[PDB]
Amino acid sequence: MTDRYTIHSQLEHLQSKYIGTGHADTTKWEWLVNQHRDSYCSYMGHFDLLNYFAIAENESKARVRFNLMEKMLQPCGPP
Amino acid sequence: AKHHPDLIFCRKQAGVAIGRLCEKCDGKCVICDSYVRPCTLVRICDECNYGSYQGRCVICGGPGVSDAYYCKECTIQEKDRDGCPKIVNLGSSKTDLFYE
Amino acid sequence: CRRIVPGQFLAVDPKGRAVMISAIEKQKLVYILNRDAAARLTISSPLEAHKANTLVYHVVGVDVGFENPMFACLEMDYEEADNDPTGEAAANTQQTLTFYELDLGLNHVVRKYSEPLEEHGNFLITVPGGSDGPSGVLICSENYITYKNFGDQPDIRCPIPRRRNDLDDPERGMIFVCSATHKTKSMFFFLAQTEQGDIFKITLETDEDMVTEIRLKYFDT
Amino acid sequence: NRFTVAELKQLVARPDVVEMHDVTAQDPKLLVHLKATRNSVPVPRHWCFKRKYLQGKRGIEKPPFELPDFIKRTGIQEMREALQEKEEQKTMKSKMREKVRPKMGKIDIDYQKLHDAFFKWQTKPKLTIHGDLYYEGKEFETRL
Amino acid sequence: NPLTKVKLINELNEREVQLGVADKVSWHSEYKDSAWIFLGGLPYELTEGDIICVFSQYGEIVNINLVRDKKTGKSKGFCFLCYEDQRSTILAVDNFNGIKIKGRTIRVDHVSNYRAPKDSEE
Amino acid sequence: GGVWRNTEDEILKAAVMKYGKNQWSRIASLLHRKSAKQCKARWYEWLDPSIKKTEWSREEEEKLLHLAKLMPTQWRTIAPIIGRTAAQCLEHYEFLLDKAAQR
Amino acid sequence: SYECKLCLTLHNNEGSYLAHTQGKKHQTNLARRAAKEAKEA
Amino acid sequence: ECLEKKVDMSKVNLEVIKPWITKRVTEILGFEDDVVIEFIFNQLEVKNPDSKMMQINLTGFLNGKNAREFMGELWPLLLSAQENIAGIPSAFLEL
Amino acid sequence: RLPPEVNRILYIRNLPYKITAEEMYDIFGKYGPIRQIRVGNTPETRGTAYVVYEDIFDAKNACDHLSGFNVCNRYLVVLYYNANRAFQKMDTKKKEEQLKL
Amino acid sequence: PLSDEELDAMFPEGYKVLTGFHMQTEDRTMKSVNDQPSGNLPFLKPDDIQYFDKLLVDVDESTLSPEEQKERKIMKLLLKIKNGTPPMRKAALRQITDKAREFGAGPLFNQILPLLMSPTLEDQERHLLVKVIDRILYKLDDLVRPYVHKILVVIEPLLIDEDYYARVEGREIISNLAKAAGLATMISTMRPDIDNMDEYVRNTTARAFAVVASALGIPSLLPFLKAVCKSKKSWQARHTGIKIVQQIAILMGCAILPHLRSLVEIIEHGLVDEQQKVRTISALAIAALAEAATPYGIESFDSVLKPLWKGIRQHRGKGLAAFLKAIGYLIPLMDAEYANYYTREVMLILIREFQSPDEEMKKIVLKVVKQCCGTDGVEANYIKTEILPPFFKHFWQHRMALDRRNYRQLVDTTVELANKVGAAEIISRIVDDLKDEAEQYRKMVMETIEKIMGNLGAADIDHKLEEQLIDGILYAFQEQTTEDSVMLNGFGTVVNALGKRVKPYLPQICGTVLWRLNNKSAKVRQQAADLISRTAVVMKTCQEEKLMGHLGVVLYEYLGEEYPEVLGSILGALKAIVNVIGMHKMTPPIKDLLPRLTPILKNRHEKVQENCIDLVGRIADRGAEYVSAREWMRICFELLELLKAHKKAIRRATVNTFGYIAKAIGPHDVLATLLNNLKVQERQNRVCTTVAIAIVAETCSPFTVLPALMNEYRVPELNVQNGVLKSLSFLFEYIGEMGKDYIYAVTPLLEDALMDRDLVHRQTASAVVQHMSLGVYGFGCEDSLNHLLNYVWPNVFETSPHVIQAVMGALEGLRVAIGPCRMLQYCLQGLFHPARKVRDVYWKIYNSIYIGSQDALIAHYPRIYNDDKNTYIRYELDYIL
RNA sequence: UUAUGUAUUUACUGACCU
Ligand SMILES: [Zn+2]
Ligand SMILES: [Zn+2]
Ligand SMILES: [Zn+2]
16 A cells, blocks of 8 residues: 555656755755766766876776676665 | 836747747846847747747747847847746736726 | 766667657657758657666667667666665666657657667667678677577577787776677678777678677677 | 864864854864865954844945046146036026037047046056955955 | 528627628628528437427518428428528527527528528538 | 825815915915815815714704605705715715615 | 935825824923923923 | 565566456546556556555545555555566466 | 526615514515515624525516615615535435326 | 425524505604615625625624634625625735635535526636635635535536636636545545536536546546446446546647547447437547547557448538548548548548538538648649539628628638649639628638738749739728738738739739718728838838828828827838838928927827827837937836836836936936836836836946936935846846946945835845846856855845745855855855744745756765764765775 | 734836737
8 A cells, every 4th residue: 555645746846857956855865976977977978087086096087987886776875 | 127126027948939929028138127238149948939839029028020139238148048038928008007 | 078968879760751859767769750842851850768767888780681670679667776775676677679660651759679688788880780690789789799689590690819928907897898899791790899909800701691690700809 | 962162162173163053063074174264264254243244334424436546637627527517507498409509519629538548558557365255344454 | 500590690790780780781781682691510309390380480481491301301400591681680690699499509600592401510 | 095094184274374264275285186176075064164074963854864865866965954064974874764664 | 205204204205294294292202302302391 | 664675567468457457446436547557557557566555546536545445455466466477376277 | 588697585784673574575576476585693794684586587687687776775786696516415305296287 | 386395404503494645754763774784895796695684683792692603704705805895805815825724615605606607697706716716726725525515507508608707717616626536535525426417517517527537547537438438328428428538638639648548448339329319429539639639649540430430421410520620630641542532532432511501511612612622632733623612602601701700710721722732723612702791701811812922922823813902902901890810910911922024014903092081070081091111011122102201291190189099000101111211311301200200209008108109119219319408307207107107018118218318418317317206105116216226227228327327316215226126137137247236336336225124125135136137147257246145144034925935036046156156155054043033934945956066066065974774975986095 | 123924005126018
């Protein structure tokens, strides 16, 4: 069964479908995990931050992209 | 528009169909809604340009004459890279005035 | 370089009829390319393939010879990975190879097939098809290469050859970094490359129209 | 649940910012971390008041406006005050008469002086750095 | 649909009387040379004589034509009328369109060809 | 309509203080809705400083209840005789006292 | 615009001020300030 | 809660399941419809359906008690048939 | 003739308080057979009534020629009530065929 | 017929069952009872004294008083809205929306709904009532759950209503009712209104399902449509569900496309059913889906073509008509082989059905001809041999000109037959009927000819036929009864098509017009002047300036009219001549033409004002040397009264004329005029002289306006100070990158404006900060904007809507100027603040920054140290080479 | 003396509007 969790959506006031915006009741974990995900897509987005990160290890660029890419699922830790 | 705060935009994906403005609203920007410095053409979605709705005004829904544009101040704020700016609902103005 | 808007991953149909531009999260776009009577290139309105809470690791053009174009992508859905504080739900959240088929007759994009993966693949390689080959997508991954193709092909696994006794592995895997397909008008092969530089000659040798088994060898370095 | 300003002031590496309301937050430690992060500017002083941010400017009468000096050295203030004062003597008879028979050349000052005042004689004003947010008094505390 | 055509032929006359169309070109100048009119939606209790009694107000109908069915039926629902004068048909399509007899509302229009035994709108 | 709110009553008091008594167009020239007829009507009907607009006495009520029996209508003839004189303050008295003599 | 200065109240036009001469009698609550002005009558 | 052990409609038959559901909804609201029996049909067409959406859209027509007992009846029949390779629940295997 | 005029009902306003029972029976059985009347209880509705007949033409007789008719000394105004609501939808009635017809 | 159980089920409570002679009157017991209630409120009509009956007595709120009079103070409110003056309207309406959560849906809807369900309403009263309902649907979210059906049985006939805006009101509030009630409430509600006997409620429930389907998406209720359409106990359910599919297709046009296949597979269970109604509406639904797809999905209809083909072969009647509409809409979706095959064996049926008596099948085959001759297949000689002769025999009648949906369909099909066959073949068959005696029929022929000759062109018409249409349009232009423009535009399009070949008809036309411009004064003189304005183009490109110089001087003295609409068309004609000739070479020369126009400019009619200042604008920039330069000064006092003009084209042309007058005579005389105009009390008259100050600024450069405009902030009046701030707003918006020079001159002004008590000062100075912020971007002026941000930023907490949107536009305009870093520095230490009132405002400022520039924030985030369980340090940025 | 709830004018805003 279930009880009373019927909340499909409501008045389309602004449609903040941009993920990562956040509202008043947004906790520390939520906007820090959006902060880490935006950081990761900007790391692999720019070529040259990915250069800078690949020089610091000896790892190749696809190794660094696969590491950064698999960390985007749960980067900060469990809620 | 900015004047009527209850008007809602369409905001779906902008296709290839170029927006049009009526004769009463030529020169108006669509978002900032002014007259000067037009810089960027309007691309409207395919649902808001289908069949009977072709060449129709973006704002008024009257018969379009000229192409629609964004300001430079809408352009450099990238208010053109959101959805299609086709004002959908007609609400609480030009309705009661029709009943008056 | 945003997260939501496309531009990071770019796939194209091998015949040249559509093109998909896709982001690392939530949203993908398909343009339909055609040519009009001045022999001139034209672009439709962008078709939409939005899927919320979804990572994309790579995207690729599945060759189908004058069929509805398909695109293959390694996705991952993470909403149960961020709802459960136990931590293990985000530890068993394996990727999915997903195929988007463009109904040119119906002018929209549908998720056709969606199959999970028993390891995390990093990027895909197009296999030529139609009349030339066994149309599908190779999937490179840590210590494996896998031919998957939907419908009837059993999933073919080939473990990646490490070197003899090279002294770099306490515990470390081995991925590919390059694909380099080649179509020599008799057969087709792939100049893949591990992360050290060891180019492999991957050749698909198929007895039926179906794939049979894949095989490779140390080409050069 | 809401551990008070004693312990919350004891835990934080910069305790000099934690206030009487920060205990009543929904996440106190990051609030007083971001309150003690480096180059932020704080919330305005009137978030807790009862006076709608400037309705305390009631009875004080203030001077109209000081024009900057490069504009005052064009004589536009003296010409404009002179014709305002001459226009305060006119009736509607002459205000409607010199609407249809207009004397012109009332100002006709020049164009080179105005161009020099905005281009040759331009004065940098006294600006302020990005921290110096405004509160209600702020110019009657000139005592610093 | 079966009697919105009543509304359409009525909106014809209401739009002519709105615009003020002279009788030389007031749509009955196309249905000249025909004293025939198609009735529509009669009740099945209506014999030939009762239809002559109601529609003879503007002239005695010379040639009536009910659609009596072949064997199993007795009446289908139309009738065709041919008066003395064509202006009787003008009067009848203006005046007897949308009247109702024992329930069902009937309609009238011109014909302009002939007694068609079954083509028209059931 | 003639609604006569307070922000025109007090301006009318100021205008009659400045201009005078038989000079009404000149003070209807500053009210934006009112004509001089309405200005006369209010300043003699409500705003006149001689109007004793409260304090119903006992002598004037025993006066009017057999003064409005002499001439039965006509509350503008018996308004200066009573001197309550607003000519509807008299009608207020007479209808209130014929409610209180009925109840 | 117009202001009752003891009142500290704003007024748009003229008859908004000079109809604010009757309510809110601070006009006689300066008897307290007159008692501070002089400790007797 | 118990409605979340997932299902695959390829594992189950459906034409044997319909008359039981018709009989149950004739018991629940007294009389016979089609559009709610065809709701059962068309909601259980999709290969991996959702039970919470099922419970909402039956809570609408039915009480909210009868939707609760109806989901608590109908979902274990689906599980008892999808465990079996035959595709038949225990109430129709044994009887 | 006249469909769009609701009948079998008649709203009665400005009716005296001295109506014990009888005078509405007088005035409203004067014109024909009555079904019943409604007498208010709130001191608003006290002094304001309904009357329902078994006939249409009697309600026409009432509302065509009692408009502003003066009675015991407060003249009443007549209207037609608007039936719009209910409180309970009636259920489990049998009303079977039973061979009556 | 009633019983007493239904009778007390009907009535409300608070009720219990149980010659001649002269004498005199007496003084009564004061028969002066109240008939209208106790206040000012409105007047009550005699029909409203059942609904507002409880207001005629005073409650004196105690001893009859639960909270219920609070829930019938709404009775007073509905009376004030329905019958009141508009201040009372907006007062009561704001009051009822602000307390709609307090009143609850129970009392409020069971008073509103029987008021709308009265047989004695009015269209404006219906409008104000549905306004009340949709204004209380935003507040009563998820509270109208019992009250959906009771809203719908009132609202649903707005969908079938006549006037268009009432239909849009119906669709909008059912969409809001759909998004507010969710989905399961809708399916619970409108299912029993399917099998219901009344075809009104059945049709209208179908349209209601279509609009809730649009508001909630197809696949939510697509199992419901699949459910109700395959139900087989009564055909009315199937007819209703297929009607639902039809109106979903005709409502949301090409957004039915990705759900099309799973939607068409419903409908082919119809077309074979035993009712002709179900097959007919299944074909109409296929026609709506095929209209909607266009040109897609043709292989998704391939299961429908065989029963359509069998149906058009075997049937006759209206089922043939629906099948014929369906195949006519299908075959443009089809590839050219199958399309040409289905065309060439459906033309036979169309030729068979040009004889048809019924008007709806006339409409359907008149639509089918539009599409079945457009593709490739039907060649020209086939069409001009036997498609069009019975077409012109049976469709060009008079009755088909009267009905508007039979009017426009016929002309839009005739144009397509002209596209395929040719120009003169259609025209030569209908040009002889521009001389008819029906005005609507000549209007139809003229609209046909203007659309053909605007599309194709006029090269196909020989010299044996252009005289036929020239005399046709002259006779048609001479004898029109109405005020329509269709024959004016027809004349203009025809002569623009004939071009230079119209040369031996300009004497005939100009003679007809010059004689035509006397005519009893009988308002066919704006037809003559409008015809001059339309044919003014063709006389220059046909080497005619003598007759241009002839009728320019004639229109110079038809402008002393008393009729305004004559003089407006005179000025339109004279405008078109001033364009088509040069200004400096025209025969009533501008030296003595503009002084005739200055007293015309004091005419308060809108048409005469509009045309007069369009002409004065062209004269004022291109001919400013034809004056005294006193004269421009005494008309730039006329252009202040030429504001306050209720059309907004006048108001935006007069500010352009201020700019041009200024570029003529200098910006020290026109500007003192515009600055005396700033104390007026009237907007539409101060904001549009503020705009004119910005125009005279940007034309003749600021430093000519900006000292005096900077000065008049010192004038102690509210209106002039907000005026100079609004003129700085429009000025910086107009000049753009020239704000690099003037930002230090206006920053000490804006610091005083933002420092000021009044909030209108702060909203106008915030708009100035916005436009200046976007005008100096990328020029190194980030110190002044960071100064002014310290004064903008405390205005964040203001809740007046104009000032909060002005400061929030200023913040999202300062984002690009000084950086996302500086704006993120101001957002921090207040996103998490304990009060929600400050928290949500800083979160929406942060959302505007985040969507405004998401990537630039990556460098700019703070460092957030690690807690117990989670890692919050972005380590990759921190390590180094 | 900050302040409410309201009856209630007066001012003011949005290039609001045939
Ligand atoms: Zn803009
Ligand atoms: Zn759109
Ligand atoms: Zn417009």
